[PDB]
Amino acid sequence: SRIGKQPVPVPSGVDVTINGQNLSVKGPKGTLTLDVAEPISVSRAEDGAIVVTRPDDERRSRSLHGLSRTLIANLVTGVTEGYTQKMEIFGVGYRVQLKGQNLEFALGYSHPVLIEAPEGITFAVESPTKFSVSGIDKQKVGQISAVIRRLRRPDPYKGKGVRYEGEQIRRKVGKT
Amino acid sequence: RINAAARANDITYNRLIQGLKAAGVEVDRKNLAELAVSDPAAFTALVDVARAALPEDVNAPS
Amino acid sequence: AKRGRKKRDRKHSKANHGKRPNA
Amino acid sequence: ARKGILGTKLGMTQVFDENNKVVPVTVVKAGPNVVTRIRTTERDGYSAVQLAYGEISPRKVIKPVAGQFAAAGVNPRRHVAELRLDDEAAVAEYEVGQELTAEIFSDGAYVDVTGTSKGKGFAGTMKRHGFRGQGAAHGAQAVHRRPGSIGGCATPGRVFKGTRMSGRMGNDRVTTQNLKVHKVDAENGVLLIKGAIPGRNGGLVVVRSAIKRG
Amino acid sequence: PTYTPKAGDTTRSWYVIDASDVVLGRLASAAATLLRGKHKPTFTPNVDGGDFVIVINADKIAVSGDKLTKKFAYRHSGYPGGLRKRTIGELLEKHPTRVVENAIIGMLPHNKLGRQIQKKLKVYAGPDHPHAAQQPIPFEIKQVAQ
Amino acid sequence: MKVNPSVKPICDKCRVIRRHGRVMVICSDPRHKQRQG
RNA sequence: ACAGGAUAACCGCUGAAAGCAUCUAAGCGGGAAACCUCUUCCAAGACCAGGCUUCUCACCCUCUAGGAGGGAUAAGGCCCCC
RNA sequence: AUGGUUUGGCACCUCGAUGUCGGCUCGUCGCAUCCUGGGGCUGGAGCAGGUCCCAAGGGUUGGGCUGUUCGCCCAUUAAAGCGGCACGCGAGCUGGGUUUAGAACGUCGUGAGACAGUUCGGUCUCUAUCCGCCGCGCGCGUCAGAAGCUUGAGGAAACCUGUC
RNA sequence: UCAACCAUAGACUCGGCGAAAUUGCACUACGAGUAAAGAUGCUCGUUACGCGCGGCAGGACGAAAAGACCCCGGGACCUUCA
RNA sequence: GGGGAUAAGCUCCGUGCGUCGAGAGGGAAACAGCCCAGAUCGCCGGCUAAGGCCCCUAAGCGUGUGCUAAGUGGAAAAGGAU
């Protein structure tokens, strides 16, 4: 509601397209699609923007309004700017490298962990201890980055594992 | 059988009986069924009679 | 127990009117 | 793929491997099989190959069977059987009139052999289901091999379906899996398969590639 | 006396119901009605004077709520522990027609005449049926008003 | 996780929610995690 | 067994309602010897009694030729026989 | 509060008979899971655990004592689960115990005799009609009669695990 | 442990003679229920072509014996400072 | 109202209270004691009660306004709960 009321400003390098609830955007980074929930009114504003409102005030509509607005916001900013997540690694021997477009971690296992890059996602390695995922869907980005984050069990005693950039994990101490 | 023939004439059994009792048709269900089987036209005529004798808003107290 | 419970709750019906033999 | 063949069991014997270790084998006359019909999805709803095996006089053949073998375009055989496949790409290899021999297999291949178990007749629950019997002493009145109890009591009040009782054992289709062929012998047209095979000697079998181990 | 059919009075008509976005029980009640003959004034409960009922697009049947995942079609083999359950979604993707069948069969009488009435029910998961020679009438599931 | 019919906050960070038909309690402190059951 | 699918507990992503947050309300994923598939076996009396093929695919008589009844046959099968 | 397995309360079927404990055999079910499997929290460094959640697919030893169930013990184990099914199962077995008649000890009783006291001994009947179950046939049907090869709705089986 | 095999007498098959206990009936299913509180027979469903043969013994609260235990009533015999 | 654990389909009393007993019929799925109603017989006539009107199953997938998302309805406590 309070999120859904403010529309989304469309930059220049954007090509929006609608047939009803459906939606297809194009930008420099690629293209994207979205079939909006039916009770949420969608319109293409005169001021180079996408307005989204709700006819009723039922809780379902109030939820879907703000959600759809945020979804279009993420959609356009991904298809124009992109969506990146920088990750980094801690612990001796805990490293990663790029085997083409897939990644290969060593994380103290008896074998290397091969992460296959799915469609729409592109990886990168600023360093064996610092890497990044990039794409246009925030969902898929966070999904694969979390799949990466959960590759090793949490190690609050010595921090050995994958983390996000500015992550403040919990910690303990095992004295004995 | 009456319900069948009535719903074929686009009316329910209950409102048919209601309309017949309002129209003063003392015909019994036996003969109504026999009409429905043997004289569907006469059944339709009685259906029209009952639909006329019914009120304009059957869901009103009156 | 379940059997007695069900048999007693049977009395909470529109027909039985909150009473039944052996409740 | 799951290439296969019909044959006849001849009997067991020994061989010795390169390590001088003994191998109990069964010799299967995996013989000249001939393809008589192709099963397709556009015709039959499933992909398979109909094979035929066993020399037979053309007078002991039932005339419908003769007509089938004729319209195929081959001479009749005794036993006929289908091999199910996985796809039209797998059935496209088999042509009618094609001849299959033991050479489709190779030494070290793993096979599944389907045969018809030997008949043990009307068997008791001991021989049939491995029931412990009861005591041969200590008072046992005439229950030395009897199954004992058969169900519960009134609460069940019946015998559950599938209870293990006396009856005919054997003459059942048995697939023994993952038998390693010790040797192919195309000169004789046989397979030396490591270990037991279902059925009597002279019994028909189907040696197929192992659906688990390639 | 009251009418009874005699050996050639049972006329058969073929109806066809598009089960696309139609409620399962709604459709099944209507189809059972037609199959039994309640829609006919010659209805005699000791006679399968009903009509043939084709159902198409059974896979596109509509099921409300969480019934697609939390309503189970149970089945027993006769053997102990031989209860096998399968949800309606599992049943729709495996055997689409079975849900519509089971619904109608339960809505029908459980008797010899019910068995005879099942035979007039044809159910097909697509929009197409082979019973076009029989010239089936489309049957929209209405509601008589009052 | 604790699974009890009485799930309630334990500190000021413990937040209560209804997730998938179950009353959950979440927190930074995973000790305070709870679920109704 | 391998493998796959859908899942439990659980881990989550994107995210509102509730300017934040939230694994969820719309959506998207992962996830167990359980479940379905997979393996083996029975199975069309599966009364929706299935399917692909092949064979015989042909005679008489009586009732008054209506609907049948009887006989002789084919393909084939059964019995006897080893 | 659950459950209904314990001791009980009631005395509702059964006293013109519903055979009892324990074991043997055969199992089947539930999960309130002993192992195996998955996971959360941990005062979880790691090994190993504790606790909770999910999970009933399979598996869940052999012996000494005792009638015994139970239990203790011995060795093992991955584990040596808890319960229901007439405290499953005696028209399937045993019959050691309880629970007839014999006899004896102790105690009680004047006595005959008695003892949820002990002790030794002590008939376990029945040709399966029906259901059910295991298997096997005969008939008819599946819109002519036959034959061969088959699909697989739907069921059954199997599903364990250690050491290095 | 841990059971396997052989023969014989039965069981099985054919011929011949030919009983029995029992029996309210009968074209005598299963589940969950309900019910004199443990159902072939009732309810709702599920399953099941008809008829036999050999077998097993879970039920028919199976047969047998008007429960011996318990109680009530009555006997009998026994004891004794009735 | 007593006894009982203010348990028992428990027991013992009271009640110009009822029903069964000795009472069919309809409803309550089935179901002596609950609800309706007290069966002179017959009728292929009608109105009703209780209870019900999507199909099984006779009658309404009734009308209007709201509520419910839990298949609640179509068992349950303390207590927990944006």
Edge-to-edge strand ranges of the sheet holding A22-26:
A15-19, A22-26, A31-35
Buried b (16+ CB within 10 A) or exposed e, D72-111: bebebbeebbbbebeeeebbeebeeeeebebebbeeebbb
Contact residues on chain E for B38, CB-CB shorter than 8 A: 3
Beta bridge partners of E18: E56
Task: Please give the single-letter amino acid code of residue D68.
Answer: Q
Q: Decide if D193 contacts D207 (C-beta within 8 A).
A: yes
Amino acid letter, B20: L
Could you tell me if A31 and A13 are in contact, meaning their C-beta atoms sit under 8 angstroms apart? no
Beta-strand relationship, E137-138 and E14-18:
parallel
- CB atoms closer than 10 angstroms to residue B48: 13
Contacts of B57 in chain E (CB under 8 A): none
In A20-154, where do the E strands start and end?
A: 22-26, 31-35, 41-45, 49-53, 83-90, 95-99, 102-106, 113-115, 122-127, 130-135
Task: Please tell me the number of Cα atoms within 13 Å of E135 on its side-chain side.
Answer: 2
d(CA A23, CA A51): 13
The one-character DSSP state at D3 is -
Q: Which of E27, E21, E14, E18 is nearest to E100 (CA)?
A: E27
CA distance E80 to chain D (A): 7
Q: Give CA–CA dist D40/D88, Å, rounded.
A: 7
- Structure-block tokens of residue D149: 């109890």
Tell me the residue ranges of DSSP E strands in D3-72.
4-16, 22-30, 33-39, 48-53
Report the Cα F17 to chain-centroid distance in Å: 8
Rounded distance, CA B45 to CA B39, Å?
A: 10
D21: tokens are: 């270790």
The closest of E25, E68, E59 to E127, measured between CA atoms, is: E59
- Of D97, D105, D99, which is closest to residue D4 (Cα–Cα)? D105
Residue F18 CA to residue F37 CA, distance in Å, equals 13
Residue of B49, B57, B4 lying closest to B27 (CA atoms): B49
How far, in Å, CA of B52 to CA of B24, rounded?
12
**Residue E146: count of CB within 10 angstroms of its CB:** 13
D184, D25 in Cβ contact below 8 A?
Answer: no
Residue E143 Cα, gap to closest chain B Cα (Å): 9
| SS3 readout for chain E | CCCCCCCCCCCCCEEEEECCCCEHHHHHHHHHHHHHCCCCCCCCCCCCCCCEEEEECHHHCECCCCHHHHCEEEEECCCCCCEEEEEHHHHHHHCCHHHHHHHHHHHCCCCHHHHHHHCCEEECCCCCCCCCCCCCEECCCCCCCC
**SS3 for B6?**
helix
Distance CA E3, CA E1 (A): 6
Question: Nearest residue to nucleotide J64 when comparing alpha carbons to its C1'?
Answer: B59
- CB contact at 8 A, B49 and B19: yes
Q: At what angle do helices B40-53 and B29-38 cross, to 10 degrees?
A: 130
Q: Mind giving me the DSSP string for D111-172?
A: EEEEEEPPP-EEE-HHHHH------SSTT--S-SS-----S--TTT-SPPTT----EEE---
Cβ within 8 Å of residue A106, ≥6 positions away: A93, A94, A95, A96, A112, A113
Residue in E38, E41, E144 closest to B37 by CB? E41
Q: Find the angle CA(A150)-CA(A156)-CA(A158) to the nearest 5 degrees.
A: 105
Question: What is the C-alpha separation between D36 and D52, in angstroms, rounded?
Answer: 7
Contact E124, E55 (CB under 8 A): yes
F vs C contact (3+ beta-carbon pairs below 8 A): no
Cβ neighbour number for residue D45 with a 10 Å cutoff: 8
Asked if residues E122 and E128 have their Cβ atoms less than 8 Å apart, the reply is no
Give the residue on E whose Cα is nearest the Cα of B57.
Answer: E146
Taking the CA atoms of B39, B45, B47 and B53 in sequence, report the sign of the dihedral they define.
Answer: negative
Query: Sheet of A161-164: strands edge to edge?
Result: A122-127, A130-135, A83-90, A161-164
Resolution in Å equals 2.8
Distance, CA of A53 to CA of A61 (rounded, Å): 9
The protein residue nearest I48 (Cα–C1') is: E78
Residues E57 and E126: beta-carbon distance below 8 Å: yes
Q: Using an 8 Å Cβ cutoff, are A68 and A3 in contact?
A: no
- SS3 for A138? helix
Q: Are D100 and D51 in contact (CB under 8 A)?
A: yes
What does R_g of chain F's alpha carbons equal in angstroms? 9
Exposure of E12 in the CB half-sphere (CA atoms within 13 A): 16
Please tell me whether residue C6 adopts helix, strand or coil conformation: helix
The three-state secondary structure class of D44 is coil
CA of B25 and C1' of I48: distance in angstroms?
52
Amino acid (one-letter) located at A168 = Q
Residue labelled with tokens 């990750």: A87
A49-54 long-range CB contacts below 8 Å, 24 or more apart?
Answer: A49/A7, A49/A8, A49/A9, A49/A10, A50/A7, A50/A8, A50/A10, A50/A16, A50/A76, A51/A7, A52/A4, A52/A7, A52/A8, A53/A4, A53/A5, A54/A1, A54/A4
Residue B19's closest chain E neighbor by CA?
A: E146
Neighbour count for residue E94 (Cβ, 10 Å): 9
CA distance readout (Å), A89 to A96, A99, A123, A162, A169: 8, 18, 15, 5, 13
Residues facing A31 on adjacent strands: A26
CB interface of D with E, residues 160-199, below 8 Å: 160-162
Element (H, E) at B29: helix B29-38
- Give the other-Cβ count within 10 Å of E44's Cβ: 16
**Residues with Cβ < 8 Å from E66, sequence gap 6 or more?**
none
The string of DSSP codes covering D58-88 is: TTSS-HHHHHHHHHHTS---SEEEEEE-S-H
Let me know: does D94 contact D35? Beta carbons within 8 Å.
yes
E neighbour chains, 3+ CB pairs within 8 Å: B, D
**Cα dihedral sign for B37, B40, B42, B48?**
positive
In whole angstroms, how far apart are CA E38 and each of A135, B43, E45?
62, 17, 9
| Substitution target from D155, D158, D159, D160 for chain E, most E beta carbons within 10 A | D160
Residue for token pair 């869907």: A137
Cα A41 to Cα B32: distance, rounded to the nearest angstrom: 55
> Which residue stretches of A28-99 are H helix?
59-80
Which positions on strand H lie below 7 Å from a protein C-beta?
3-4, 24-30, 39-46, 52-54, 57, 85-86, 88-90, 92-95, 124-125, 131-136, 146-157
State the CB neighbour count (10 A cutoff) for residue D122: 11
Q: Check whether residue D152 has its CB closer than 7 Å to nucleic acid strand I.
A: yes
Structure determination method: cryo-EM
By CB atoms closer than 10 A (0-12, 13-18, 19+), residue E144 is: middle
* Distance, CA of D34 to CA of D76 (rounded, Å): 10
Quote the CA–CA distance of D123 and D110 in Å, as a whole number. 33
Tokens of D203: 């019994």
Distance between CA atoms of A11 and A26, rounded to whole angstroms?
A: 12
CB atoms within 10 A of CB D7: 30
Distance from C-alpha of D83 to C-alpha of D38, rounded to nearest angstrom: 10
Structure tokens, D180: 């390693």
| Residue listed under structure tokens 């195929």 | D72
Sheet holding D99-100, edge to edge: D79-84, D48-53, D33-39, D99-100
Contacts of E78 in chain D (CB under 8 A): 161
State the smallest CA–CA distance between residue D125 and chain E in angstroms.
Answer: 19
**Torsion angle, CA of A99/A102/A107/A112, rounded to 10 degrees?**
-70
CB F11 within 8 A of CB F27: yes
Cα of A8 vs its chain's centroid, Å: 18
How close E78 gets to chain D, by Cα (Å)? 7
Inter-helix orientation angle E97-107/E24-36, to 10°: 60
SS3 B3: helix
- Helix (H) or strand (E) holding F26, with range, is strand F22-26
Which of E15, E38, E43 is the mutation pick for testing B, counting most B CBs within 10 A? E43
CA distance D207 to D65: 24
The values of phi and psi at residue D169, to 5°, are: -110, 150
Q: How far apart are CA A105 and CA A131, in angstroms?
A: 11
3-state secondary structure at position B16: helix
Interaxial angle between packed helices B13-23 and B40-53, expressed in degrees from 0 to 180 and rounded to the nearest 10: 70
